[PDB]
Amino acid sequence: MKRFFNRFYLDTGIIADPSQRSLASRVSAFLVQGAVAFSLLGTIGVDTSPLIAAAGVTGATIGFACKDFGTNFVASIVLSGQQSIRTGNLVCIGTGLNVVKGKVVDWDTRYLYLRSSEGHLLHVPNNMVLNSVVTWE
Amino acid sequence: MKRFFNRFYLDTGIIADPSQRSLASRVSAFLVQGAVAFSLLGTIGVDTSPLIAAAGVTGATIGFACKDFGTNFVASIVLSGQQSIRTGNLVCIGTGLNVVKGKVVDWDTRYLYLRSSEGHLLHVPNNMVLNSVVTWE
Amino acid sequence: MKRFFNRFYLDTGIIADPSQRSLASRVSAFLVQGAVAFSLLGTIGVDTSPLIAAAGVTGATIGFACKDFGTNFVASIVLSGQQSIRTGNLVCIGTGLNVVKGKVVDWDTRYLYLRSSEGHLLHVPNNMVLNSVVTWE
Amino acid sequence: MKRFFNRFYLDTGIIADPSQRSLASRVSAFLVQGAVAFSLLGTIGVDTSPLIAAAGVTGATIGFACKDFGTNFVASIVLSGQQSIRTGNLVCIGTGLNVVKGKVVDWDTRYLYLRSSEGHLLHVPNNMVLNSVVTWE
Amino acid sequence: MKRFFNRFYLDTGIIADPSQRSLASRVSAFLVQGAVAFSLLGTIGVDTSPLIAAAGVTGATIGFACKDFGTNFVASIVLSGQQSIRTGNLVCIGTGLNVVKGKVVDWDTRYLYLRSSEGHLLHVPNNMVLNSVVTWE
Amino acid sequence: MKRFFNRFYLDTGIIADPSQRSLASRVSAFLVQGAVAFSLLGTIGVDTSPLIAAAGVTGATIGFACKDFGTNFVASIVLSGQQSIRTGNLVCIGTGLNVVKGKVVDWDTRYLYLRSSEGHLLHVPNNMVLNSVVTWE
Amino acid sequence: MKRFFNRFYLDTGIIADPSQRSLASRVSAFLVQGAVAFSLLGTIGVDTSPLIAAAGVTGATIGFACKDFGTNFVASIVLSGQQSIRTGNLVCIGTGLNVVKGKVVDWDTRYLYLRSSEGHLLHVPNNMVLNSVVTWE
DSSP states (O other), X not given: OHHHHHHHHHHHTSOOOXXXXXXXXXXXXXXXXXHXXXXXXXXXXXXXXXXXXXXXXXXXXXHHHTHHHHHHHHHHHHHSSOSSSOTTOEEEEOSTTSOEEEXXXXXXXSEEEEEXXXXXXXXXXXXXXXXXXXEEO | OHHHHHHHHHHHXXXXXXXXXXXXXXXXXXXXXXXXXXXXXXXXXOOOHHHHHHHXXXXXXXXXXXXXXXXXXXXXXXXXXXXXXXXXXXXXXXXXXXXXXXXXXXXXXXXXXXXXSSOOEEEEEHHHHHTSOEEEO | OHHHHHHHHHHHTSOOOXXXXXXXXXXXXXXXXXXXXXXXXXXXXXXXXXXHHHHHXXXXXXXXXXXXXXXXXXXXXHHSSOSSSXXXXXXXXXXXXXXXXXXXEEEOSSEEEEEOSSOOEXXXXXXXXXTSOEEEO | OHHHHHHHHHHHTSOXXXXXXXXXXXXXXXXXXXXXXXXHHHHHTOOOHHHHHHHHHHHHHHHHHTHXXXXXXXXXXXXXXXXXXXXXXXXXXXXXXXXXXXXXXXXXXXXXXEEOSSOOEEEEEHHHHHTSOEEEO | OHXXXXXXXXXXXXXXXXXXXXXXXXXXXXXXXXXHHHHHXXXXXXXXXXXXXXXXXXXXHHHHHTHHHHHHHHHXXXXXXXXXXXXXXXXEEOSTTSOEEEEEEEEOSSEEEEEOSSOOEEEEEHHHHHTSOEEEO | OHHHHHHXXXXXXXXXXXXXXXXXXXXXXXXXXXXXXXXHHHHHTOOOHHHHHHHHHHHHHHHHHTHHHHHHHHHHHHHSSOSSSOTXXXXXXXXXXXXXXXXXXXXXXXXXXXXXXXXXXXXXXXXXXXXXXXXXX | OHHHXXXXXXXXXXXXXXXXXXXHHHHHHHXXXXXXXXXXXXXXXXXXXXXXXXXXXXXXXXXHHTHHHHHHHHHXXXXXXXXXXXXXXXXXXXXXXXXXXXXXXXXXXXXXXXEOSSOOEEEEEHHHHHTXXXXXX
16 A cells, blocks of 8 residues: 555656655555544444544644645645746745745745855745745746 | 536636536546445445544535635635736735735736836735726726 | 525625635535545445544545635635725725825725726725724725 | 514514514524425435535535635624713714714714715724724823 | 433533523523433434534534624633722722723623723723723722 | 542642642542543433533533633643743743843742742733743843 | 553654653543443343443543643654754744744753744744744744
């Protein structure tokens, strides 16, 4: 199951980092195996309502705690294949006082790296890049 | 099922890009087939509560992670057929310091492209265009 | 069922546009027919929990994605029959720097149109008009 | 049932407008009759899970779409019987730049009307009056 | 049941106003009696799922509509027995431009009354007092 | 059960005030006894769905109304054992105009007390201290 | 079970502090044992719906009360292995007036410690570091 999930993630392009892909494949395989085991246990007569409730509560708490990380990952996935965000492109993000100015140097799954005029490296979250006015010179 | 979903999306006009339409058709066909298979499995006696709980948790997490993308897509769908947003029209979006000024050059499913006076390309999110005061000269 | 829903929407005044009324009637008729079919299927013994879960997840995601459009529509419905918002009335919306000044020219289900002193057409969202201080001269 | 709901709304003072009271009585009577009919149908053996799910989804979407209207109505109900908000009383609402200054002229279920020094009529939402610092001279 | 709920509210100190206490006692007695009646009806065989769903939807909508009132009431309950908020005490609420300055004159379940230097009566919501920096001279 | 809950709260250090500990022990014992009684009633055949629904709705409404108090309590629990927040330590909380300056004098479960340069006592909510930049000289 | 959870937390690197790891292991072991006991009780015939409802309500309230702590912990986990945040690195967090300037001195699971130019110790929450523009010189 781990190999199947790894191949699916590679083909769909959701995860490109091999380490993240392996970790996600392991997590997904564990979740699927647990769900199948719970269904098999409940088939024969064993009550599964407490187990389902506890698993759902834990999963909801974990997902709500990792909301920012998930949002940044989804923004990174969506922003892929954008002509504005390319290496060497001078971009400006934000309107008003909350403005960010620099040249794109590297692209990540959590941050967008810009090189300022003074040489400082700027780490702009991908969610911030998603919900903002991007100005490309 | 994929062809049926593709034809439905084409006729309803929700998705116009052929690639996005094909991807959405594949996803919808997979979801419908999975739901039918789960119902058939539960009909004969196999417990389906753990599978339903896991699928619902995963779907809720994915939908909450793609909230910004979905909102931008819905805003793009709604804004279609607006006389204010046309190629060559000079529009102004926002009130106060958070103001955006330019001429519409291209329209997308994620961004609204404006050409400033200096020539910089502005990427205004469609959700931002939805919930803002649009000024058309 | 489509004719019944169209007549109900016409009588209740929720939807006045014939095209929107027809689309809403078709959607409502489809939803009611699907619910009745699911209930009939579940009556004879076929498990319906996976189908109900999938339909509910899809409906919740769609409704949460169209939240802004629904809010604007409800604001348009509520604001109807307001003496302040009339054609030719000079109104001012907002307090502070985020202020909008103009004369009402046309009223829509998504936007409120104002003509500025310079002649620019202002598109004020109906939700913004709902939750703001309206100043009428 | 309509007469009973109308009398209850009149006695409890939640709704004072006869038209709004009649509309709310009709809606409540329809909801109660539908719930009783669904319970009776489910008693004899007909599956009611799809119908309950569809009705709940529709009701949740409608209630979330009318959130602002409901909040304004509740604020209007709560603010009743306040010595500060009386006809002819000079009140000031808000702190900082977002300030509203005028004399109370009329009170509504959606807006609070103030007459400025220049004579402009101010429409302050009741929810805004609830969650703000009210200054009475 | 009304007398029991009234005595409980009096002893626990949640509600001190006799009118509010009587209204809350009536509401709580009605809710408990309705729940017991529904349970008794469902015991003998009558389906109760539609009734439970409708009651839950109505209760959730009402509770979400009265969120501000409930929050202000809870803040009033919590703030009781605070040395800073006493009659004749000169307090300052808020930081920055959104600042409120005055002397405490009267305390309520919805508002905190302050007398300014000019003599204007300030109505500070109890929720605002809860989530703000209180400065006591 | 009250003694067991009191001892557990004392050992875990969640509640240190004897009065609050006793009140929480009474509430927890009542909740556990009610849950056990409901389970016993439902075991013999009495329908418990209406009772569970009503109890859950009431508990959710109460918990959502006491959200600020619960958040402040949790922040007080978390901030315990912080070298920055000590008696006699000069700390500064917040960035920008919304800044608070003073010396720590007393620590509470709802507020953090600071003594300004002029001698005014500042009541900073513990939730505000949690989600802010603390500057220690 | 406590030893298994402790080893899992150590291997996965989610918790590095031995005290926090032991506390989390105890909590997780208690939760798993309680879920298994509830399932075993419900298998033989004892109704478990009230117990599940009460446990779920309590868990949801606790998780919503500890939302800030959980978010800060998740941000601390995510930020690990970032070249920008290292001891002795001069970083700047935030844009506009809400800006923080200093040199990293120590890293924690709740705060990020910076040494200003004047020598004041700055406590920047990890969630704030996650959702902000980090400037590294």
